[PDB]
Amino acid sequence: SLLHTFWRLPVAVFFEPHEENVLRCPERVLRRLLEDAAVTMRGGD
């Protein structure tokens, strides 16, 4: 589950979303997306 990383230390972010991509999302949002997709997928001899 845990990812391996090349850089030993993390760095702060000083750029807007229109120039570099960053994966950021709260845990609650992740759980909500998971359950919503779970119901959606099923919703779709």
Binding site: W7, R8, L9, V11, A12, F14
Partner: protein
């Protein structure tokens, strides 16, 4: 001069001899060894000691301030400096003492300025076939 203590071994002697012989355009010559009678003169000894002291002091002093300052960093460079120091370390105090060590670092840094930098005095624009002489503008 830095190899002065290790002169016993043949490899060090070979390195010293290679260092002595220098070649510039169409000219080859050898520079004298600053070690005489198996000993180093006091001025070159002071220079080498100053270089080594600056290195040693910086090595231990740097990390403490780097880790404090890099958290604030807005240029993502100081974190890289911290990581470089961590790699270097993995390959291997009273405030008065800290003040003394910082002041000593800077005073040993000042001792090297004669070796560290040098200034141009002439820039040449003419040369005779007699090349022993040339015309040049003076800079000071």
């Amino acid at each position: 001069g830095l190899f002065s203590l290790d002169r016993s071994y043949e490899e060090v002697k070979a390195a010293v001899q290679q260092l002595q012989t220098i070649t510039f355009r169409d000219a080859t010559f050898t520079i004298p060894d600053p070690v005489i009678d198996q000993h180093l003169l006091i001025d070159m000894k002071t220079a080498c000691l100053s270089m080594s002291m600056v290195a040693n002091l910086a090595s231990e002093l740097t990390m403490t301030y780097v880790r404090k300052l890099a958290l604030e960093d807005s240029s993502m460079l100081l974190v890289k400096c911290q990581e470089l120091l961590m790699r270097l370390d993995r390959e291997r105090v009273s405030p008065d003492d800290e003040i003394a060590r910082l002041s000593a670092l800077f005073v040993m840094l000042r001792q090297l300025d004669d070796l560290i930098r040098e200034q141009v005095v002439f820039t040449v624009c003419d040369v005779s076939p007699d090349n022993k002489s040339a015309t040049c503008i003076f800079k000071g």
